[PDB]
Amino acid sequence: VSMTKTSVDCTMYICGDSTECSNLLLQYGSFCTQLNRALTGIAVEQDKNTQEVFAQVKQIYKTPPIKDFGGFNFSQILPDPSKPSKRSFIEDLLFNKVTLADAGFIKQYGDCLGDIAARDLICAQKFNGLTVLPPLLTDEMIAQYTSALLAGTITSGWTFGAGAALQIPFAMQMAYRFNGIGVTQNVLYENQKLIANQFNSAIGKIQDSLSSTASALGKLQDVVNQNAQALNTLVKQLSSNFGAISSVLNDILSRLDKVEAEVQIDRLITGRLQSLQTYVTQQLIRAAEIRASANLAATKMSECVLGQSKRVDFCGKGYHLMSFPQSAPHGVVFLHVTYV
Amino acid sequence: IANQFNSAIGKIQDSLSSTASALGKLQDVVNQNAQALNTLVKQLSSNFGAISSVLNDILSRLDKVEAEVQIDRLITGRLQSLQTYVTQQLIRAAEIRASANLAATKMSECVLGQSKRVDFCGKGYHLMSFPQSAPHGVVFLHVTYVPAQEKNFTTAPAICHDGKAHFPREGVFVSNGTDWFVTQRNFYEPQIITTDNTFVSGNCDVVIGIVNNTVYDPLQPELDSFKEELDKYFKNHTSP
Amino acid sequence: TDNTFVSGNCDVVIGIVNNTVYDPLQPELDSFKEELDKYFKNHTSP
Amino acid sequence: SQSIIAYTMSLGAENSVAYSNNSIAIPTNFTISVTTEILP
Ligand SMILES: *[C@@H]1O[C@H](CO)[C@@H](O[C@@H]2O[C@H](CO)[C@@H](O[C@H]3O[C@H](CO)[C@@H](O)[C@H](O)[C@@H]3O)[C@H](O)[C@H]2NC(C)=O)[C@H](O)[C@H]1NC(C)=O
Ligand SMILES: *[C@@H]1O[C@H](CO)[C@@H](O[C@@H]2O[C@H](CO)[C@@H](O[C@H]3O[C@H](CO)[C@@H](O)[C@H](O)[C@@H]3O)[C@H](O)[C@H]2NC(C)=O)[C@H](O)[C@H]1NC(C)=O
Ligand SMILES: *[C@@H]1O[C@H](CO)[C@@H](O[C@@H]2O[C@H](CO)[C@@H](O[C@H]3O[C@H](CO)[C@@H](O)[C@H](O)[C@@H]3O)[C@H](O)[C@H]2NC(C)=O)[C@H](O)[C@H]1NC(C)=O
Ligand SMILES: *[C@@H]1O[C@H](CO)[C@@H](O[C@@H]2O[C@H](CO)[C@@H](O[C@H]3O[C@H](CO)[C@@H](O)[C@H](O)[C@@H]3O)[C@H](O)[C@H]2NC(C)=O)[C@H](O)[C@H]1NC(C)=O
Ligand SMILES: *[C@@H]1O[C@H](CO)[C@@H](O[C@@H]2O[C@H](CO)[C@@H](O[C@H]3O[C@H](CO)[C@@H](O)[C@H](O)[C@@H]3O)[C@H](O)[C@H]2NC(C)=O)[C@H](O)[C@H]1NC(C)=O
Ligand SMILES: *[C@@H]1O[C@H](CO[C@@H]2O[C@@H](C)[C@@H](O)[C@@H](O)[C@@H]2O)[C@@H](O[C@@H]2O[C@H](CO)[C@@H](O)[C@H](O)[C@H]2NC(C)=O)[C@H](O)[C@H]1NC(C)=O
Ligand SMILES: *[C@@H]1O[C@H](CO)[C@@H](O)[C@H](O)[C@H]1NC(C)=O
Ligand SMILES: *[C@@H]1O[C@H](CO)[C@@H](O)[C@H](O)[C@H]1NC(C)=O
Ligand SMILES: *[C@@H]1O[C@H](CO)[C@@H](O)[C@H](O)[C@H]1NC(C)=O
Ligand SMILES: *[C@@H]1O[C@H](CO)[C@@H](O)[C@H](O)[C@H]1NC(C)=O
């Protein structure tokens, strides 16, 4: 649904506190503002992508105190009241299963210097002018929007999508579903205890699958890994000579006088300018893959969660009954329920 | 329905006349096109380390053997400025294509049709949509049915009348608290529960939450009214 | 006749099969004929 | 008396929908809504 926001300031990346270099970098004109402006365009689009996927209700629905859903057991996908973050059991699995780089939540020297400065990459990225901004919506606010869509789905069916939420008993909602897939509603009511046991058992396999297998969240970990590998590659390009006598502007300025320091520095400015434009082009292209994924995820939220879909194999494999959204780090997970 | 629609179009007419914050998606495209060209024109001012931003000054001051070194800096920085503009435009143009293919999909599914897709053709249940042109874009006026004034009702998944269980053919069973009816799912038009409104399957022991009420047979008053005719004829024909 | 609808003669449909179609109004009218005959049979006596 | 305030954003109006195992809400009336969607 999104990727890590980043701002990279052209000045501390290229010139790294050298005012001497800064007076050369101005000779390349508006390239710095184009980079800053670009990355700001990507960073605002991450909040928009998250807003369009999750904020599909203007009302925060909540579940009734009595869980009488006709024998269906949503307790594993609904919020847990006992937890300090209002995640469901399946969301707390999904949140452990992705290993992040920089949430943006206040990095403040004591964590940055000394013992941790060896193993941690994220502090060194910050020291070189690369910064990761936090999302507009916390993982608590995504968990609340996901709760509203799920509590709306189990209490109200599709009606909370089309207008105000209208209560219906859950076995009568599930009958309107069966009728949608061309199965007559008495096939639910005559088999309801079996249909609930099949659903409750199937939700149990999601618990076990997510607890067991390492490959499940590959579509999300490969976003976090591309963010981290591109940032590491951009930090590593500060090591490059570009044909100058040193990788470090302070060395060149220690050794040389202005007349030829300008020639050694011009090379480092050039290549560094080229290293940022490469990263920002790669990030603009990636951001278009993530926006194409977010617009699909918003379309699936609208058509599989707020509704029921006639579209074959769109809302999982089978004939679609309903779907439950779940939050994940930088993503969304749909539990599609299908009649097979 | 016509007065609600005529008033709703009247609010589009007023809204578009009133508020500046509406066509922001289109003005953003014109602004990004204008900004990118202004930035590419401003890059002609940049020295790139040459003695001047202006190519004729270098050709005024210097002879070819070193004018070419000053020129090669400007060629390099300018050529990098074009590739930056053209990459930005190639990327942006893919966003406008994605927007156009969505607009073509909405033209096909919302204007040339009616969509069962929830929230694809405006907020509500989709009835129809009207396209309107705009500078570099399209506006769709989506027309939607939205359910408005609700009442609560008691309901049941089935009715029991003769140990046989009954389900609606279409719609849902509702009760005002004293009597029972079928209504269509999305609008309250209650009807007497009959063998035309409902279908039978199995007996009342399997359906959780089934309720007792009579189910009317509309053929029975015909055969009853003809039984009264039959008796009055037989009673008369005791006399001849 | 409530599970099915009628259109055309059997000569046009490729692969059509013969079977009875039940009319649920017919046993109502048949039971109404047995009721009519028991009334007329009793009516021989007065 | 105007100033810049800062606040945690409200996601929407909080709403406990009145679910019960035998209760249904049905609309007795409707509004035709016309809504504008804008695309490049
Ligand atoms: C909905 O399904 C839930 C998951 O199966 C179920 O919760 C589970 O219920 C069992 C039986 O009560 C618990 O088993 C444990 O019970 C206590 C817990 O302190 C232990 O002392 C026992 O040794 C035993 O391990 C599960 O732990 C419990 N799982 C969770 C995640 O809570 C619900 O009860 C079902 N809901 C309804 C309404 O039936
Ligand atoms: C539940 O819905 C029922 C059907 O609309 C409704 O019953 C109907 O109530 C009206 C009065 O409000 C009756 O109207 C008759 O009243 C007397 C009867 O002797 C006559 O003088 C009048 O001319 C008129 O015919 C309806 O006859 C009656 N229908 C039936 C089938 O009994 C209930 O009142 C509703 N209950 C609630 C709680 O809203
Ligand atoms: C819905 O209507 C049903 C028909 O009126 C009714 O079923 C009847 O329920 C009673 C009580 O369970 C049974 O009464 C008999 O119970 C035992 C023998 O089974 C005896 O001890 C009693 O003396 C008495 O004979 C009826 O036999 C039963 N009738 C049928 C045809 O099943 C339901 O109880 C009603 N339910 C509700 C909630 O209204
Ligand atoms: C399906 O049921 C049909 C009605 O019972 C049946 O039609 C009958 O078919 C036979 C053979 O074609 C006809 O028999 C007559 O054929 C000629 C005259 O047409 C004579 O030489 C024979 O002696 C005999 O009279 C029936 O007349 C015909 N009935 C009707 C109403 O058309 C189909 O054959 C059955 N098909 C199958 C596969 O079961
Ligand atoms: C269904 O909802 C309709 C609104 O969406 C509602 O229409 C409104 O009806 C009232 C009267 O009940 C009208 O009020 C005006 O009526 C006349 C003038 O026409 C005056 O005497 C009144 O003082 C008042 O000005 C509303 O103008 C009308 N609104 C619209 C948009 O037509 C229906 O009444 C509702 N229908 C049902 C069956 O509940
Ligand atoms: C639909 O019903 C809900 C709740 O159930 C009703 O509660 C009583 C008021 C009574 O009508 C019972 O027979 C029903 O079972 C209604 O929700 C209440 O709304 C009012 C404000 O209008 C609020 O003060 C109460 O706290 C709400 N109660 C609960 C439990 O949430 C709702 O108003 C009914 N809708 C309509 C259109 O009548
Ligand atoms: C509905 O809930 C009540 C308690 O409020 C319970 O007694 C009843 O058995 C339930 N009925 C059904 C059909 O689930
Ligand atoms: C009674 O039967 C006679 C014929 O036998 C007929 O003329 C008369 O109209 C009948 N009246 C009624 C009320 O059926
Ligand atoms: C079906 O195939 C059989 C041969 O297996 C053939 O005799 C028959 O005519 C075919 N029937 C139809 C309705 O096509
Ligand atoms: C026969 O007719 C008489 C009235 O003439 C009636 O009392 C009796 O019950 C009838 N019996 C039958 C079997 O119809």
Q: How buried is B226 (Cβ within 10 angstroms: 0-12 exposed, 13-18 middle, 19+ buried)?
A: exposed
Cβ atoms of A33 and A125 closer than 8 Å: no
Query: Cα distance from B114 to chain C (closest Cα, Å)?
Result: 28
Task: Decide if C28 and B223 are in contact by the 8 Å CB cutoff.
Answer: yes
Report the C-alpha gap between B172 and B183 in whole angstroms: 6
Distance A303 CA to ligand 3 centre (A): 45
CA distance B159 to A264: 90
- For B125, phi and psi rounded to 5 degrees? -95, 130
The span from the CA of D39 to the CA of B102, in Å, is 8
Ligand 5 mean position, distance from CA D32 (Å): 14
State the CB neighbour count (10 A cutoff) for residue A211.
Answer: 11
Per the CB < 8 Å rule, is A151 touching D23?
no
Is residue A304 within 8 A of residue A320, CB to CB? The reply is: yes
How many whole angstroms separate alpha carbon D30 and alpha carbon D40? 32
Q: Give me the amino acid identity at A35.
A: L
**Residue A178 sits at the chain B interface (C-beta within 8 Å):** no
Residue A9 zone, left/alpha/beta (φ > 0; ψ -120 to 50; rest): beta
Considering every ligand atom shown, identify the ligand nearest to the alpha carbon of residue C13 and give its number. Answer: 9
If we measure between CA atoms, which residue out of B40, B122, B49 comes closest to residue B85? B40
Longest CA–CA span in chain C (Å) reads 59
Listed residue (B222, B169, B175) closest to B195, CA to CA: B169
Q: A152 and D17: CB-CB below 8 Å?
A: yes
Do B167 and B223 touch, CB atoms closer than 8 A?
Answer: no
Identify from D8, D15, D28 which residue to disrupt to test chain A contact, counting A C-beta atoms within 10 A and taking the largest count: D15
CB contact under 8 A, D24 and A169: yes
Residue type, position A47, single letter: D
Determine the length of chain A: 340
- Please tell me the distance from the alpha carbon of residue A269 to that of residue A26, in angstroms, as a whole number: 11
Within 8 A by CB and 6+ apart from B102, the residues are D39
Using most ligand atoms within 8 A of CB, pick from C36, C37, C42 the residue to mutate for ligand 10. Answer: C42
Please report how the helices B24-42 and B64-106 are oriented relative to each other, as an axis angle in degrees rounded to 10.
170
Burial B174-191 (b: 16+ CB within 10 A, else e): bbeeeebbbbebbebebe
User: How many angstroms separate the alpha carbon of residue A256 from the centre of ligand 1?
Assistant: 74
The contacts of residue D23 (CB under 8 Å, 6+ apart) are: A167, A169, B152, B153, B154, B155
| Helix and strand numbers, DSSP H then E, in chain A | 14, 5
Distance D18 CA to ligand 6 centre (A): 7
- What residue in B sits closest to D22 (Cα-Cα)? B155
CB of B184 closer than 8 Å to CB of B171: yes
* Cα A154 → chain centroid: 25
Q: Dihedral, CA atoms, A137, A138, A144, A150, nearest 10 degrees?
A: 80
Give the residues across from A323 on adjacent strands. A336
Measure B89 CA to ligand 4 centroid, in angstroms.
77
The b/e string for B76-110 (b: 16+ C-beta within 10 A; e otherwise) is ebbebbeebbeebeeebeebbeebeebbeebbebb
Considering only CB atoms, D34 lies closest to which of B8, B149, B151, namely B8
Query: What sign for the dihedral angle of Cα A235, A241, A247, A249?
Result: negative
Amino acid occupying residue B117: R
What Cα–Cα distance (Å) separates residue C13 from each residue in C3, C7, C10, C17?
19, 10, 6, 10
Q: Of A157, D19, A67, A181, give the one whose Cα is nearest residue B155.
A: D19
**Ligand 9 atom 3 nearest Cα:** C15
Residues 6+ apart with CB under 8 A from A297: A1, A53, A332
SS3 for A115-137 is: CHHHHCCHHHHHHCCEECCCCCC
Chains C and A: 3 or more CB pairs within 8 Å of each other = no
Coil, helix or strand at residue A193: helix
For ligand 7, atom 12: residue with the closest CA: B209
Assigned token pair, D29: 């009336």
DSSP lists the bridge partners of residue A320 as A338
Three-class SS of residue B144? strand
Please state, in angstroms and rounded to a whole number, the distance separating the CA atoms of residues B84 and B90. 10
CB A330 within 8 A of CB A192: no
User: A327 is written with which tokens?
Assistant: 């939050």
Instruction: Identify the CA nearest to B174 among candidates A200, A90, A143, D24.
Output: D24
Paired tokens of A50: 């998250």
Q: For residue A265, what are the CA distances in angstroms to A253, A257, B43, B225, D25? A: 9, 11, 21, 108, 73
Residue type at A336 in one-letter notation: H
AA identity, residue D25: A
One-character DSSP codes across A137-170: S-HHHHHHHHHHHHHHHHHHTTHHHHSS-----H
- Pairwise CB contact (< 8 Å): A169 & D20: yes
Distance CA A9, CA A45 (A): 19
- Asked if the Cβ–Cβ distance from B201 to A161 is below 8 Å, we say no
> B227 to each of A65, B238, C42, C45, D6, how far by Cα in Å?
56, 17, 16, 21, 82
Residue with tokens 């009334």: C39
Give the whole-angstrom CA distance, residue A77 versus residue A150.
8
A81: tokens are 């009241």
User: Which amino acid does the sequence have at A251?
Assistant: D
What's the gap in Å between B165 CA and the centre of ligand 3? 15
Q: How far apart are CA A235 and CA A238, in angstroms?
A: 6
Ligand 2 nearest atom to the CA of residue B177, by list position: 38
Separation between Cα atoms, residue A185 and residue A37, nearest integer Å: 56
DSSP secondary structure string, A23-78?
HHHGGGTTHHHHHHHHHHHHHHHHHHHHHHHH---SEEEE--SS--STT---TTTS
The b-or-e profile of A247-273 (16+ CB within 10 A means b, else e) is ebbeebbeebeeeebbebbbbbbbbbb
Chain C residues whose beta carbon lies within 8 Å of the beta carbon of residue B219: 25, 28
Burial class (CB in 10 A: 0-12, 13-18, 19+), B164: middle
CB B187 within 8 A of CB D30: yes
Cα of C11 to nearest chain B Cα, Å: 32
Query: What's the reported resolution, in angstroms, to a tenth?
Result: 3.1
Rounded CA separation A314/B233 (Å):
68
CA angle A224, A229, A231 (to 5 degrees): 95
Q: Does A213 touch chain D (CB under 8 A)?
A: no
Helices and strands in chain B: count of H runs, count of E runs: 5, 10
| Residue ranges around ligand 10 (CB below 6 Å) | C 38, 42, 46
3-state secondary structure A302-332: HHHHCCCCCCCCCCCCCEEEEEEEEEECCEE
Tell whether the torsion through CA atoms of A83, A84, A90 and A96 is positive or negative: negative
Extended beta strands in chain B, E state? 125-134, 137-147, 150-155, 159-160, 164-168, 172-175, 180-183, 191-192, 198-203, 211-212
Side-chain half-sphere exposure of B9, counting CA atoms within 13 A: 9
- What is the spatial distance between Cα B43 and Cα B53, in angstroms, rounded to a whole number? 9
- The size of chain C, in residues, is 46
CA-wise closest residue to A304 among A318, A290, A325: A325
D31, B148 Cβ separation under 8 angstroms: yes
**Are C24 and C31 contacting, i.e. CB atoms less than 8 angstroms apart?**
no
Residues linked to residue B181 through DSSP beta bridges, in sequence order: B174, B192
Contacts of D39 in chain A (CB under 8 A): none
Query: Cα separation of B117 and B125, whole Å?
Result: 9
Distances (CA, A) of A116 to A104, A224, B68: 17, 21, 52
D and A: touch, per 3+ CB pairs < 8 A? yes
Question: Which tokens sit at B152?
Answer: 């609560």
From B208, B212, B213, B215, the mutation candidate for ligand 3 (largest count of ligand atoms within 8 A of CB) is B212
Q: Distance (Å, rounded) from C-alpha A278 to C-alpha B84? A: 10
3-state secondary structure B150-203: EEEEEECCCEECCCEEEEECCCEEEECCCCEEEECCCCCCCEECECCCEEEEEE
Residue type, B144: T
Alpha carbon of B236 to ligand 8 centroid (Å):
6
Give bridge partners of residue B186 from the DSSP assignment.
none
Q: Are the CB atoms for B172 and B155 separated by under 8 Å?
A: yes
Angstrom distance (rounded) from CA A320 to CA B223: 46
Q: Check: CB of residue B194 under 8 Å from CB of residue B166.
A: no
Mutation site, D19, D20, D37, interface A, largest A CB count within 10 A = D19
**What is the bridge-based pairing of β-strands D13-16 and A59-62?**
parallel
**Distance, CA of C33 to CA of C28 (rounded, Å):** 9
Residue of A nearest to B184 (CA): A176
- Asked if B25 contacts D39 with a C-beta cutoff of 8 angstroms, the reply is yes
Residue pairs spanning A and B at CB distance below 8 A? 111
- What is the CA B10 to chain-centroid distance, rounded? 20
* Token code pair at residue A85: 């973050």
How far is it, in rounded angstroms, from Cα B166 to Cα B182?
A: 11
Q: Which of A60, A165, A166 sits opposite D11 (nearest CB)?
A: A60
Phi and psi of D14, rounded to 5°? -70, 135
Write the burial class of residue A139 (CB in 10 Å: 0-12 exposed, 13-18 middle, 19+ buried). middle
Cβ atoms within 10 Å, residue B38: 11
Residues facing A338 on adjacent strands:
A320
Q: Which of A160, A123, A78 is nearest to A235 (CA)?
A: A123
CA distances from A97 to A146, A218, B1 (A): 18, 10, 52
Q: How far is the CA of C36 from the centre of ligand 10 (A)?
A: 13
Q: How was this structure determined?
A: cryo-EM
Which chain B residues have any C-beta within 8 angstroms of a chain A C-beta? 39, 42-43, 45-49, 77, 84, 87-88, 91, 94-95, 98, 116-120, 123-125, 146-148, 150, 152, 155, 157-158, 165, 167-168, 172, 185, 199, 201-202, 206-209
How many other C-beta atoms are found inside a 10 Å radius of the C-beta of residue B54?
Answer: 14
Residue of minimum CA distance from atom 10 in ligand 10: C42
The set of residues, in sequence order, having a beta carbon less than 8 Å from that of D24 and lying 6+ positions away, is A166, A167, A168, A169, A172, B152, B153, B154, B155, B172, B174
Contact C28 B230 (CB under 8 A): no
Could you tell me if A15 lies within 8 Å of chain D, comparing CB atoms?
A: no
